[PDB]
Chains A and B, each alone.
Chain A
Amino acid sequence: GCPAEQRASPLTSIISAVVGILLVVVLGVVFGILIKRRQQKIRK
């Protein structure tokens, strides 16, 4: 079953968002460099 409803703890919304942006940034550079290596050599 899913967790009951809520309507408090505004600090939870912030942490969630921070993770979303931080995740996209890391995955963005990681995934990009992960695929690039397959294309061609960029690091000399």
Chain B
Amino acid sequence: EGCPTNGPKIPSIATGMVGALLLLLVVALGIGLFMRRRHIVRKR
């Protein structure tokens, strides 16, 4: 009928970059903590 309520307007696609960065930090924290939980250090 009408009233599309807009759509393609920032924020929108920017989420992509943020998602990649956030995930990277989230994974790195999970993998690093899990790998370190076993006292497995590369150097001290």
Please list the residues of chain A having a beta carbon within 8 angstroms of any beta carbon in chain B. Answer: 3-4, 6, 9, 12-13, 15-17, 19-20, 23-24
Among the interface residues B10, B14, B18, B23, which one has the most CB atoms of the partner chain A within 10 A?
B23
Tally of contact residues, B, Cβ under 8 A:
15
Query: B41 at the A/B interface (Cβ < 8 Å)?
Result: no
Please list the residues of chain B having a beta carbon within 8 angstroms of any beta carbon in chain A. Answer: 10-20, 22-24, 27
Question: CB distance B16 to A16 under 8 Å?
Answer: yes
Question: CB distance A3 to B16 under 8 Å?
Answer: no
Contact of A24 among B10, B12, B24 (CB under 8 A): B24
Say how far B35's CB is from chain A's closest CB, in angstroms: 14
